[PDB]
Ligand binder design. Structure first.
Ligand code: NA
Ligand code: NA
Lengths: 4, 240, 240, 4
């Protein structure tokens, strides 16, 4: 999980 | 004839309309923006989902802020007379009001304005849909355990996340918002009005995802999308 | 039992909830804000409309920015356990993100945050509705002739006007948005899901109103409201 | 008609  | 009613957008034009997917995965080194791993999953699923709805899908990948604007200006000058609606999906980085091309930002307003009822006549009174998977700020949601029509009318903004907040993407599964959007069209486009589909998408994203991170700051965070409807009728992806 | 489904908010708690109407008509001279003529029409109609829906209505008039915050902090600390939802109507001046008390501004976020799912437990998972008749900027629409849930989830912002735009009010008839909101609840609350009612309100405001002014700048302008839904289920004002 |  990563943030854009 | 008989008693008529006009609470729904006419969706039986010969063509449903264009679906523009702008997938921006790799960014110029000079901007300092990381590659958006997994967004190709998002792009392929959208393409397939909107194909099933009978939209003319055009994927574009790694567009610069100039090519984004030029693409949109070109698409807004085409003749949409025979088309029912217009969809545009933006997969990328951003801040509130702003989406990044591969080399720097674009204001959403500059893009959407191309389609204002007074600047894109062949789409006046038809629903123009904008689906935005991008950040809208830097906040993190910790959750809790349980003159005749406005030029701005007939737009629907389907925002991946709430105003001011981060948007979440999984590098294997795709972005939470888009996985859920496509799932819920698959399952409900032939039964539900669009607003009720997005509400399902909201509940899915809100209930079935929780971020996971080795970094305390980013672990165990949540997301709720934002529907901005300036629509004036109900929108069904089928006709009688 | 039988097959169950849970796509709707539970609205058969003993009480529908509170409806807070904040009607701000007269502003401290030192702010330079004109009196909002006609907003009493809006206030009376809302009161009557939400009475018919079985909400416990509390009108407050000419609140200062401190009394607004204190009212909301107090209302968010009450026990909403027996209540189905929460409605709050703000009638006033504003800018994007901001509503004015009689003596200066309040950020919408400060108000709404009081009811975040983690700060107002007895409303967690119940729909919290915020109806805002206020300006959102200074633009004018010329028209064209034809951790388990997000803390931010379960809010619905019913905006009188689009982002960045002026909101229109008539000094005899009340504000376009509110006249239409109350009309459409009268007529459709016992038939339509809320999102479909607001869409009707959108179409009414967009189709049946055109400003009239002796000032070229302000004459012949239009308005389209903005629905911001972070709701997670559908919302009906009746139960079975 | 007035603006708020
Ligand atoms: Na997302
Ligand atoms: Na109004």
């Amino acid at each position: 999980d990563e943030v854009d | 004839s008989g008693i008529s009613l006009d609470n729904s957008y006419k969706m039986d034009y010969p063509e449903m309309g264009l679906c523009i997917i702008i997938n921006n995965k790799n960014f110029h080194k000079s901007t300092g923006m990381t590659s958006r791993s997994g967004t190709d999953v998002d792009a392929a699923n959208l393409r397939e989902t909107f194909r099933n709805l009978k939209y003319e899908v055009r994927n574009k990948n790694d567009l610069t802020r100039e090519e984004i604007v030029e693409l949109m200006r070109d698409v807004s000058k085409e003749d949409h007379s025979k088309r029912s609606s217009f969809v545009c999906v933006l997969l990328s980085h951003g801040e509130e009001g702003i989406i990044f091309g591969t080399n720097g930002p674009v204001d959403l307003k500059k893009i959407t304005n191309f389609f204002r009822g007074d600047r894109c006549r062949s789409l006046t009174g038809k629903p123009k849909l904008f689906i935005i998977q991008a950040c809208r700020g830097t906040e993190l949601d910790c959750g809790i355990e349980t003159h005749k029509i406005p030029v701005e009318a007939d737009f629907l903004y389907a925002y991946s996340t709430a105003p001011g907040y981060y948007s979440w993407r999984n590098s294997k599964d795709g972005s939470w918002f888009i996985q859920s959007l496509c799932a819920m069209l698959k399952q409900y486009a032939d039964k539900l009005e669009f607003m009720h589909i997005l509400t399902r998408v909201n509940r899915k994203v809100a209930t079935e995802f929780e971020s996971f991170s080795f970094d305390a700051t980013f672990h165990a965070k949540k997301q709720i999308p934002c529907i901005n409807s300036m629509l004036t009728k109900e929108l069904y992806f089928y006709h009688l």
